[PDB]
């Protein structure tokens, strides 16, 4: 129950201290996927709540069995975390410098072809940073490091913690998970921000396919300023 605890409780909790952080997001009181027009039928009788970020939106007959539901929850969480990382990493280099510094290539969907250029990939356009020029070496390092990471994920489980919420000392240095109630509220926040990032990534793909870049079409067009 570290110093970060009771600090999140006073400030970062999304509900008043008298009210618990359960009811607005769990149980029969969930906002549901059609707002005030949801009607009892559109909520499946097995999507009863009791899990983070469900709005009773199963239009196709997916889930309906606990194993499928739990699995799909796990891939949703993983895609969401990776999408948060992807969106923030796609928007950071363009924000820091939108100019085409030869070794930089700020555009997110054009940095792949930067490795084949003579200038290579120069982190922050600094000539002495990495300065990679070989795609095969990057391939090999990706394969080795991510194979080790995922093998540790799906084989080196402590056999006592959740596969996707390990917690513990190493994954929760600040000890946010001291209280189960705030833990569930934080899980709800994580799921919702992850879904927002996933839609941001999909829209980024589509708008890169149609229009040029991210800053332009947000400052060049649709926000004439």
């Amino acid at each position: 129950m570290t110093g970060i605890a009771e600090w999140y409780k006073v400030y970062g909790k999304s509900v008043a201290p008298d009210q618990d952080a359960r009811a607005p997001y769990y149980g029969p009181n969930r906002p549901l996927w059609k707002g005030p027009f949801t009607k009892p039928k559109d909520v499946p009788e097995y999507l009863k709540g009791e899990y983070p970020g469900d709005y009773g939106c199963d239009i196709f007959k997916l889930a309906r069995l606990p194993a499928n539901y739990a699995r799909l929850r796990t891939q949703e969480l993983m895609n969401g975390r990776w999408a948060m990382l992807g969106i923030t990493g796609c928007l950071t280099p363009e924000l820091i410098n939108s100019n085409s510094t030869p070794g930089f290539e700020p555009v997110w969907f054009n940095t792949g072809a930067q490795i084949f250029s003579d200038a290579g990939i120069d982190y922050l356009g600094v000539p002495g940073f990495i300065n990679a020029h070989s795609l095969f070496a990057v391939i090999v390092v990706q394969a080795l490091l991510m194979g080790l990471a995922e093998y540790a994920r799906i084989k080196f489980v402590p056999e006592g913690a959740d596969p996707f919420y390990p917690g513990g000392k190493t994954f929760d240095p600040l000890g946010f998970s001291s209280d189960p109630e705030i833990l569930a509220e934080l899980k709800v926040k994580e799921i919702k921000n992850g879904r927002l990032a996933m839609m941001a990534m999909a829209g980024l793909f589509a708008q890169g396919a149609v229009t040029g870049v991210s800053p332009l079409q947000n400052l060049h067009d649709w926000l004439h300023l």
């Binding site: 007959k61 997916l62 069995l65 194993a67 499928n68 699995r71």
Partner: protein, 205 residues
């Protein structure tokens, strides 16, 4: 038992072998829900049938064009040729004609046997029992497919789906190789028979 795709490994629990050609190949677990298997087998049947048709239409006319007895143009440019009718009009005509077939297919997969009666003359019908197998005079002219199967039907079904999968791979191969190489499949075949090592994926790029 049955010959698995991967020897020495347990097959997925949802594949009992009853379905034709069950090789126990579900690495990604996309068939964990029993009700999904029926839709997936129907979809794979439809793609495999249309893929066998497409493979025949992309290979036999081109092979006979190579033989010289036929003058069939390259299939990649077939849609850009001049025809006596508007291609978009042809599209809408085939759409309208096939809408009835698609409605029949949807109705029978949702509810088997509900479209098994000829509307104009109710006497005419089809003899099929399994979902997606009508039999009858219209769809089974030779009466093949309604037989007491101790070992009869299953082998035919298995070789049918095997040929379907092979044709699926063949048609995507043809599309991909035409995209990669601006030449017909027969040109690539002649190149690989002349010198397989010299002509390959790396040969073009």
């Amino acid at each position: 038992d049955r010959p698995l795709w991967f020897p020495g490994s347990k097959a997925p629990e949802w594949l009992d072998g009853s379905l034709p050609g069950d090789f126990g190949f579900d690495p990604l677990g996309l068939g964990s829900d029993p009700e999904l298997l029926k839709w997936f087998v129907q979809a794979e049947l439809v793609h495999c049938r249309w893929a066998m048709l497409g493979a025949a239409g992309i290979f036999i006319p081109e092979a006979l064009t190579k033989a010289g007895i036929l003058n069939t143009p390259s299939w990649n440019v077939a849609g850009d040729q001049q025809y006596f009718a508007d291609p978009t009009t042809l599209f809408v005509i085939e759409l309208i004609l096939f809408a009835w077939a698609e409605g029949r297919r949807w109705a029978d997969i949702v509810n088997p046997g509900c479209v098994n009666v000829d509307p104009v003359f109710p006497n005419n019908k089809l003899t099929g029992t399994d979902v997606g197998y009508p039999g009858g005079l219209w769809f089974d002219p030779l009466g093949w497919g309604q037989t007491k199967d101790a070992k009869k039907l299953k082998e035919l079904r298995t070789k049918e789906i095997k040929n379907g999968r092979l044709a699926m791979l063949a048609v995507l191969g043809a599309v991909v190789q035409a995209n990669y190489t601006h030449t017909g499949p027969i040109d690539n075949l002649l190149a690989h028979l002349a010198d397989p090592g010299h002509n390959t994926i790396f040969a073009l790029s």
